[PDB]
């Protein structure tokens, strides 16, 4: 079974407010961060058709800052699927709606595992793109996937260490 | 300059309410992150004596799950000091409050840059280890600083394409 | 100059907890419908909007805690200065994959130059048989919205 | 059974914080929203003496901006007593404290049902207006309420298209 | 210049909420004292006629349990008026709205001091009750605001010692 | 059986922000105080605890936006199953590693078995000048407690 990756997307628009920012005018990092878990654990369960469990938050960059007033456009996609587990990236876009312009001002990685009744891990569709920015994720995340094993390893080094 | 990993490490107690889990008990990913967010703006800052900005999250993973009613303690310390650039670890653990233990349940890495008056990038004093856990981390950042400089290749690359 | 009923369309997932509740309580419900109403009618209107009304909220299936949400705003009527936005709110069955309306509002914006003066928007059309339903059920929304603002205006004079 | 307007009147006082506003300093009209079926479900509670679900929203008029830092009076009470289902009218005042006056910047009216222990329409008593205002509200409500019967065929047009 | 303790009387009722409750479903001291906080000032207001900032609470005492779904009636009075000081007792009350029956759940005495508009202590009018419970707080107030004078002596002695 | 005023002292590093004439509302301030000194108490108790009172919050500073605040709490008072918890909120300067006091409270907590009756705890005492200041003045404080538990119990008697 395979799912596209358009059929799990989901879309959030929100807009910066007081609250949601800064001593600077800028956004909050932990804000950001949750917006990005709560829409990413989302598409996470309608791609596995089952509850899901973040393992971890892979990357967050935050690349172009966000200020009050601001509206922002997070796009969420599963961009790897492995056995019981999926990688889904999240865009996070300024928004421009006067002059119709979409900026990416932060993008982030997450994998998720999906979860049947017992707590055990449940076997996920596979994923495919059919656009070349869903082909983007696709061909790149098999060399992130390897590198977010290999650094869960080394986290195993450490708690063992402590 | 130096400072020590201690001078600059920050502490943060909490426990976990109702408000901050989801409906299988477990606490929400985006709470732990907006936490884990703020405890390491704050020590980069006492560190670098200057405003600071979060350049990226570079992992968050998640070990052990967090209950409601748990009790956590955050610890977060500088890890590595570059030029203008700090890496801040946040070790986020299960406080057992009557057995007097305490459990690793997530681990964290962040960057910051510090920023002057202006808002260009400032010198920031170095930073050593003092005791074996500080040494841990200290030794292990330059394999994971040269990766974060690696995948934010990947993250312009990607922001070229789109 | 009309823009289509997609063109401005907004969406937002969300799932329901207890600080959300095994019913959903409605202020949260009408905290995430205003704010989905008003991005969408600023996409619209290319302008700052401000609320010049909640017209409606139905509150038709009950949302329980874990249930997921979409919401889903459009542009369903364009006047000259003002924007009627539908607020569609579905119980998101995600793994059988159904959607129940779970309950439906109508809003009223008005949109505003730099000044804080009215400024004119672009109409709305329909491209599908849903936005045309609401497109087509608006106009008598509209004028029971000025006819309940005239209601509206005897109850301040009288107070 | 009958009670008057006044029996089931609830009154709050809230100021205006900048959690509550957005970047103009304008109170968002989804926080009001919040807060004004709040103080109505409780009026609705007293009146009918029995839980109580809202039905809807019938209407909600924004009619004077309200700003950071003022001071808000609601005022809730029945103005309706059908045979389950009552209207409560909610009026929105910005306090003036310096010079002791109030001036209407919202009004709201809500429909509440009663419910069994069961959790089926219950009856409620009826209400009665004792001065010149709250019988301007009690005469204007059988319009609103035969509005409110007729949206709701509307409501389900709509829901059997779809 | 004087004024009763009923004109500046303020009232508010607020149903307590998941969001407002601990793992024991037990209300939060802090929100109870954040609710208590923003009645009492608003109180202040109105007595004072002018802005008024908080000295102290000078003490909250837990009662009866507070639990989510319950209902509260607050209830804010000037209770002592000196100079350019206010003291406001807040009554909270657990709300029985089907058997209409109140009880005192919590109690708590806050000192505000009014402003001018430079930011200088401000006279007060004079405070006098009307009924009975009114005329209880008024005359037992002179040992309360004698207990408060003491203790921003000890306060200040804490500073200087640290 | 005894713990030192440090064994259960707990810490809490925030930044003043809007949601927080933006000097710092008491509310959270003292929601703050409220958390991190329950922390303390269940440490120091071993066992979950109830909040009796807040015996008062000075004011001493103001607050504005962009001060660093850093909460400690200690327990200052161990009774048989009572503790009075002080908790200290300092202004943090951090660029010239200074500290100044802008708030003080102390609050009295109970420890509760499983049961739900009242539980032993264990004494508490001072290791440096700090703690033993508050430790020193806690019993005159505590006095002024009981008195106040009193009043407020015939309060409710009167009504």
Same mark, same amino acid.
Not at 143 to 153: D, G, H, L, T, Y
């Given at each position: 079974?395979? #799912?596209?990756?358009?059929?799990? #997307?989901?879309? &959030?628009?929100?807009?910066?407010?007081? =609250?949601?920012?800064?001593?600077?005018?800028?956004?909050?990092?932990? /804000? $950001?961060?949750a917006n990005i878990d709560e829409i990413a654990a989302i598409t996470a369960m309608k791609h596995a058709g089952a509850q899901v469990v973040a393992?971890? /938050?892979?990357?967050?960059?935050? @690349? #172009?800052?966000?200020?009050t007033g601001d509206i922002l456009q997070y796009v969420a996609m599963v961009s790897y699927a492995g056995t019981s587990s999926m990688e889904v990236v999240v865009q996070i876009r300024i928004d421009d709606v006067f002059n119709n312009k979409?900026? @990416?001002?932060? @993008?982030?990685? $997450?994998?998720?595992?999906? @979860?049947?009744?017992?707590?055990?891990? &449940?076997?996920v569709p596979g994923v495919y793109p059919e656009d070349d920015v869903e082909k983007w994720f696709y061909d790149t995340a098999? =060399?992130?996937?390897?590198?977010?094993?290999?650094?869960?390893?080394?986290? #195993?080094q450490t708690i063992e260490y402590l």
């Open positions: 079974p395979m #799912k596209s990756m358009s059929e799990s #997307k989901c879309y &959030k628009n929100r807009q910066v407010f007081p =609250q949601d920012t800064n001593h600077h005018h800028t956004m909050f990092g932990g /804000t $950001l961060m393992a971890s /938050t892979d990357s967050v960059d935050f @690349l #172009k800052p966000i200020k979409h900026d @990416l001002a932060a @993008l982030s990685y $997450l994998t998720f595992v999906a @979860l049947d009744d017992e707590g055990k891990p &449940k076997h098999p =060399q992130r996937v390897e590198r977010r094993k290999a650094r869960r390893i080394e986290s #195993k």
